[PDB]
Amino acid sequence: QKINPYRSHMKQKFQVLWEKEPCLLVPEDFYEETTKIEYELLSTVYLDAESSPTVVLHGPEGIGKTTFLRKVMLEWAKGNLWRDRFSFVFFLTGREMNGVTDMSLVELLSRDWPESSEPIEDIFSQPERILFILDGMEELKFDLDCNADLCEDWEQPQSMQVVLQSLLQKQMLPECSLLLALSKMGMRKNYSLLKHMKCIFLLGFSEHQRKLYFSHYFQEKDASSRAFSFVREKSSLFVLCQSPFLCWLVCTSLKCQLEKGEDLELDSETITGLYVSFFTKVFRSGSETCPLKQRRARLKSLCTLAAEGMWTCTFLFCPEDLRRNGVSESDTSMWLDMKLLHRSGDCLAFIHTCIQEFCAAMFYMFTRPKDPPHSVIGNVTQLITRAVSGHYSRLSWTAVFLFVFSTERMTHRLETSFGFPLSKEIKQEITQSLDTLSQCDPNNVMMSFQALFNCLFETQDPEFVAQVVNFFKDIDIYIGTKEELIICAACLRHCHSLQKFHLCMEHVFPDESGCISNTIEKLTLWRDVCSAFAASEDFEILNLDNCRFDEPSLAVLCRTLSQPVCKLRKFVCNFASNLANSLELFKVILHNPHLKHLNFYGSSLSHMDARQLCEALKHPMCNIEELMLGKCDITGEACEDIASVLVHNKKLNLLSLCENALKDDGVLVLCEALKNPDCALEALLLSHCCFSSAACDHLSQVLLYNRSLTFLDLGSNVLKDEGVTTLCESLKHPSCNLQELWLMNCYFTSVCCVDIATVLIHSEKLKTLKLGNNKIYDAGAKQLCKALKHPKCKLENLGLEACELSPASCEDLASALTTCKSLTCVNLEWITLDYDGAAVLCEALVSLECSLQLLGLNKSSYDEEIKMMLTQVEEMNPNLIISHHLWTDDEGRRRGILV
Amino acid sequence: QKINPYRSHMKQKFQVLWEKEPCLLVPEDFYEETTKIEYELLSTVYLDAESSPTVVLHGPEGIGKTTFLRKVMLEWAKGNLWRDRFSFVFFLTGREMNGVTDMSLVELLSRDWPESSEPIEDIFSQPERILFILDGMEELKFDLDCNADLCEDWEQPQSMQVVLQSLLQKQMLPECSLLLALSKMGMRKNYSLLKHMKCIFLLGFSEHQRKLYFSHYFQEKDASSRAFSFVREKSSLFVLCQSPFLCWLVCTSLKCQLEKGEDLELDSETITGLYVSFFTKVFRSGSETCPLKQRRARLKSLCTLAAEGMWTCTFLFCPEDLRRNGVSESDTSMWLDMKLLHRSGDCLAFIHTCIQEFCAAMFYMFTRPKDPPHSVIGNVTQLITRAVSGHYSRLSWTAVFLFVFSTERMTHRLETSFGFPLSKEIKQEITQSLDTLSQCDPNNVMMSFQALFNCLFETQDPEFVAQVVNFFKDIDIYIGTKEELIICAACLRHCHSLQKFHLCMEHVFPDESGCISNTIEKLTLWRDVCSAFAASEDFEILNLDNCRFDEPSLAVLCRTLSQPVCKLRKFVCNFASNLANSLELFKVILHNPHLKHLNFYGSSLSHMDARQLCEALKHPMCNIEELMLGKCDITGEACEDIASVLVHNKKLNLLSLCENALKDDGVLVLCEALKNPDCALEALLLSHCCFSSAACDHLSQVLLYNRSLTFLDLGSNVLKDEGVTTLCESLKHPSCNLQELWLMNCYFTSVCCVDIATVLIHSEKLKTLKLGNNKIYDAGAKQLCKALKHPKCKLENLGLEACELSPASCEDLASALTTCKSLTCVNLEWITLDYDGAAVLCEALVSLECSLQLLGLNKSSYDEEIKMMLTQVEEMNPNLIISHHLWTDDEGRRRGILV
């Protein structure tokens, strides 16, 4: 074996770690039996020396991930693993790293690197010979994202977050290999960050392995047989015993019950029940020579220790910390003996992070509603808020425990088992906290309804679940497993408060011959979820984002929405249309007179699909007033059918066909439908429809003959001034009812600006004009400003944003703002400014004659002097807002593009 | 609505049916509430008047399928449904149909058709106006398959099975519509038969509907509240109450418990537990003023009635039937009062088929091992065999019940509740019956391991399950759901008796980024199933038939097969090969020295996939002696690697590369590999490899230089006479070691027959030659016969099948058979014969000089005189077997095509 001092140092260090850290040391042959498959998988998956992947050790908490990583490193350091694949392996743990504030990868590695050896840069000469093991990533004080930039230099000092994110995204030592340990929650959290992923699942014990674990814990035989028989007779307990840590919990609980002499009782209704039984019986069997008052004081001090640790993302407790939280030497000895704490060096740690979270939740059970703030540990409202708001999701398990503790049954269990009283105001605290969150603005909060639903589900309190869920009106949820379907059905079964529902569902209804695959249980759960749609008589918006149905599930949803009791108003079905989908959605459209807005943005339709859609719309039970079909792959032939709808449904008044390819023959057919002075359509959006000036002829005949059409969007079309001139000739006559015109990015120039200037003088009805993103090069600007100076131009909103404007237009713009009394909004973003033009513009802006309410300008993108001038403008005209990105979101929403 | 007398007749019929059949008549508004979605879905899905679809009413037993179909027919006949879509709907029920033995569709329809109405041909004039409702298909005396042909004429008399299967496959009135009622078992049974399926699932009650049903059954309020509270406190009972029939069972059980006055106790461990509680409590509450002897005799008589009904597929009981089984008027009144039976006209029927199956299973509890045969009711051995043999699978639920009854706990429960003794030899009867079944030939007695596993699973007896499953050595199983995975894991956890395992697995491991999708539970179950492969030190053959894995499940399987304790010998992986499949399957190949046969037939490979396969095969831990790569999309370039294998692996001696496209350059490279007098390959099959005479040159150099190669298959290649003559030139020299040559379907003719005729005279080692399916005429046959008459021709097997042979060859054939003393097998199928040549052939065949053991000929395809002559031949030469399809299955198996 090659001489290596670092390898031997790690051998000694992890040999010592392997023998005293775990809850119970089992014979090594047993451990090797229990994890044989995973060890072999790892050893062969890394022998690759095209690229090397990052392998994630996947499993639930307490399954033994950290133990497996330590065994792997110990076997490598002894020379028994990766002998000819990795020369150096580094073991990084999250809690030890959290202490590091500002360090480079080299310094962190140097921490455990003996000087009497090779240098670190020399070992970095060959990066593929390095493996990084990252254990306890979920215990980090920061999140991992691509938000922060990622440097590629190991020598250069950086914050530890940047080092980890660079290592993970492979922008730092790309040749090295990564070994991650993640739970299901961590897997879902960091799936986006990880690429080229390879997974190894830990499986825990089998039934024979559970028997052997019991035989190893109980050094006798007959009581071991008794305990195994008792746990086997109960199904849920045996199922939970697959996890070695839960198995050890059950062992210690039963061992206390047996050494006490009591009969074998155990609670396995929930995981929280097993935790409560373990903690209860260890406390009773480990504290008997102590009076009740000091028992309560000691437990409360320990729980405060855990709560402070969890709120500061700390899991190692120096003696000074125990003294601060009121934990004395006697208390430390007692908890070490009863095996809720163990040493992790010179410091102490909880036997497992889950036990620490248990005590942290327990801490709130000693509290009063009118308690002074701890200034470190947040109160119940803060904990609930941080746990059900998606940004952090750090104190999740704690909150879950607290939810379960707040039930009357479990508060009773806790009080009876401990012997002292505990707070019963905690359910009310949680309820009021969730109500307060619900009454907040849904956009500013970003609720995580998966987290809230999990917490509610664990209480098994249907009335509590109904009360809490009915506080919320705008709900969004992802369903991709049966577990999440069960939880969502439980939480929404008795929900009658829905306003907006956003749903994404995958992996549940495959429709691979849905007859054989779908089950009555799945349909019943789905029907229960749908019951909220028809039971909530406040239901405005249903947004189905990339959902995957089969015929029965879709039929259930459509029949739910068809019921006359349903009050749906907006149906937003993104990217979904087939033959049976057509049939069922047409049942939806027909049956409901309350449904008025329909947005199919993105769903690629065919000729027959559009034919069937229009045939369903022509039914006289259809009250659709807004129809958005953007990016539906609609073409000219389908226009033949759409025109038909315009003839029949006098209730329809807004139609958007953006991002399609009408190609002037569809526009011809649509103008043929529109010309008839029976079509009641009031708003038309044909943005980016790949048509030209040829259609502007026919559209002109529309403008003369429609007394209902008031809004036209023709942006992103090649009009080349002939189309704009034809339309302007049509719009010269005041009898036209057009109010709003959008011709942005239409590839015209100054030449047609004269004709526009004519309509501005003759129209008494055109109030909003967007001519932005066109190269008017100050000639069009000068002509339009002179037109606006006319004492008959009733124009209210003008957009010339990003029009190749220069400081020469300023003066002429400055004179329009002070003369057009009806002009209240002007978009001039991306104009290039100097001092001599910014001064004139600001003089205009601060004037009483200037009747402008909204100015579109990008203040940040200028020098300091002009920034100071615009700030002075803001402080001298208290009615004017200067801002950029004025109309982007409004344009997207009205076109139907965003949603 | 059009006037119709048939409609009114069906209205009266189903109106009478609707009011007396059900267990409890609920208000009609309640029923319509409980089935609103399904009714609307049917009504709107059929209004479409393109092909006609088959609509299936899907749900578990007792969910209300028959009730829903009857209400649908009543509403149709009342004019409230399908008023403008169907003119005539026929309601076919299995039990009523079973009485018909041999009748046509017209007569069966006329059965319930009044004469004073329209004619049958006139109503068949427009088939589009016809709907068929098929209820109780699982209660048929015959099975439904596609084996029998399907005629399109309704007038022609046929057996009812043929009419029904033609109706289902739409080869009889294809324009008609179908409405089927099926269970999960029936759905999986008949999925193959049905096409264009449409499904409507019945959902049963919701929670509020369960409350309302309780309030409706219990006409008071306080016990309704008490019953609902008790059922709600128990999870399993509430879950089971979703089914209306199970809900009525629970209602009656609780009603007996309350009117008796006892506390509310109920066992809900299994569905069989609920049935036992219902039956026990109904019997106790309905026969208490009766002495024990007559209680037991009455229950036994009812059980006998049920048993005769189940074994004769009868479910309506005329009074003579009750008298024959010993059921009197007093007994009928008692059972009607306790609501185990109800009237269905002048006759009685069991309240539900499930109750009848329950009683039929109960009947065996009154029997003795040494009992005389009932001559109608089969004994326990016959019942178990018919239940776990796939051919019948009719009495499944009965057997399931009997299994649960046979446990000690449930026998104790039944004895305690009833009060009289019951048989305790039934576990032994079933175990011995299954042992005897296992010792039968696995090819004949078609076990249905899904049925056996379900029966074993329901007993919840791990020891009994292990004992029964270890009786079987050859197991084949399909896993397509999580339920079936759980069942197979439970049954195979402690199985260590495996010899051959055939597996087809779908729909469980999607590999849609298996990290997020796969769960530890599923992986654990799969590992438990795989544990049988490595725990059974007799494991010969593992056949994965079109299985679909992800990385973790495949890795679990491969690591299982890698263990040195594993004794795998034959690995048949049909239709699976990718890059990750490559890595893991190479772990399988490398690790195991016991593995010797490898068949990848059907798995589409690529250039690099074949490269990686060959590189894995070149490892020196590889003991493969047989390699089958038929229909693997292998081409000439991959031969370069394949040739390498032939050079390296001195253990390999059989290679089959059939159904590939080698195209003479691959064959060139392979012959370059074979020429080397180190290649130990002994048998090569290049059938259907798309090569020509150009390869026969190189193959010739093979036969001179390979002292180990003894079998060559070159069938179905365009070899013409030049290739065969080149090969014969190579094989003339006695130094060639070739023992078997297959040149069937090789497009040669009489011209090369001279050279073959030379080799037959000069070879001392060529024992089997197949020249079938080649257009050698009687001239070639005569030349070969003259060769065989030479006193040096040591040819043992000759195939001249399908060679355009005529009665002129007979004489020359007849004289070769009596001269070639070494010629023991000759295939002459498809030869045309007359009397004067058949006589010569038979005179040869019945002769002492004829040393033939096997003659390949199709006796059935000749006139009566020649048939009688060949029958006399068989009756005069007791050593000669005449048969057709002589070598087809052997050819397929040896090429690796079949399996």
Ligand SMILES: Nc1ncnc2c1ncn2[C@@H]1O[C@H](COP(=O)(O)OP(=O)(O)O)[C@@H](O)[C@H]1O
């Ligand atoms: N295979 C095993 N055999 C015996 N004990 C185990 C095994 N796996 C885990 N344990 C015990 O369970 C605990 C698992 O905790 P840990 O190893 O931190 O897993 P995780 O990080 O997944 O929670 C350890 O304290 C160890 O004592």
Ligand SMILES: Nc1ncnc2c1ncn2[C@@H]1O[C@H](COP(=O)(O)OP(=O)(O)O)[C@@H](O)[C@H]1O
């Ligand atoms: N929707 C329902 N509402 C109330 N009771 C029902 C309903 N469906 C079925 N039942 C009851 O359940 C029992 C079983 O009915 P059945 O239609 O025979 O089930 P299946 O057709 O599945 O065998 C009947 O006695 C009936 O009274």
